[PDB]
Design a protein around this ligand. Structure first.
Ligand SMILES: Nc1nc2c(ncn2[C@@H]2O[C@@H]3COP(=O)(O)O[C@H]4[C@@H](O)[C@H](n5cnc6c(=O)[nH]c(N)nc65)O[C@@H]4COP(=O)(O)O[C@H]3[C@H]2O)c(=O)[nH]1
Ligand SMILES: Nc1ncnc2c1ncn2[C@@H]1O[C@@H]2COP(=O)(O)OP(=O)(O)OC[C@H]3O[C@@H](O[C@H]2[C@H]1O)[C@H](O)[C@@H]3O
Length: 104
C-alpha cells in the first residue's frame, strides 16, 4: 500500500508516481521545480506567458529594480495520450487512496 502522502514525499524527491486505480493507462505524475525569475526576463523574453500578464508585470516593475517573481513548484501529468498536463490536480479518490506506486 502507498498513500498520497507517501507519493507526495516521493514526488518531492524527484520521482515519477502513479495510481494503479486510474482509468487511463501508462500515466504518471511529476513535480516541476520552483524558480525565481527576473522581471525583465518575464516581460521581454519568456515565450510561454500571455501578453496581458507580461503587461501586468511590466507595469508593476518597469523592467528594472533588481526584481524577481517566484514561480512555485507544481505537479504535472504525462497523460494517457502522451501530452503533458501542467497543473495536475488530485481527485478526492486520488487524495484518499492507497494504491499509489513509484513509476521511476
Ligand atoms: N508552452 C510551454 N512551453 C514550455 C513548457 N516547458 C517549456 N517550454 C518552452 O521551453 C522553453 C525553455 O524552457 P526552460 O529551459 O525551462 O526555460 C525557462 C525557465 O528557465 C523559466 N521559466 C519560465 N516559466 C517558468 C515557470 O513557471 N517555472 C520555472 N521554474 N521556470 C520558469 O524561463 C525560461 C524561459 O521560458 P520560455 O521563454 O517560455 O521558454 C521555454 C518555453 O518556450 C511548458 O510547459 N509549456
Ligand atoms: N488528459 C488529462 N488531462 C488532465 N488531467 C488528467 C488527464 N487524464 C487524467 N487526468 C487526471 O488524472 C486523474 C485520473 O485519471 P483518469 O482515471 O484516467 O481520469 P478519467 O477517467 O479520464 O476521468 C476524468 C476525471 O478524473 C479525475 O481525475 C483525473 C485527472 O485529475 C478528474 O476529476 C477528471 O474530471
Amino acid at each position: 500500500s502507498m498513500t498520497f502522502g507517501q507519493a507526495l514525499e516521493s514526488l518531492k524527491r524527484g520521482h515519477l508516481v502513479a495510481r494503479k486505480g486510474w482509468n487511463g493507462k501508462g500515466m504518471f505524475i511529476f513535480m516541476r521545480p520552483e524558480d525565481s525569475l527576473p522581471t525583465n526576463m518575464i516581460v521581454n523574453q519568456v515565450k510561454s506567458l500571455p501578453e496581458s500578464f507580461k503587461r501586468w508585470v511590466a507595469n508593476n516593475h518597469g523592467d528594472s529594480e533588481t526584481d524577481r517573481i517566484k514561480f512555485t513548484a507544481y505537479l504535472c501529468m504525462k497523460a494517457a495520450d502522451g501530452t503533458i498536463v501542467n497543473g495536475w490536480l488530485a481527485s478526492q479518490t486520488d487524495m484518499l487512496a492507497n494504491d499509489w506506486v513509484i513509476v521511476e
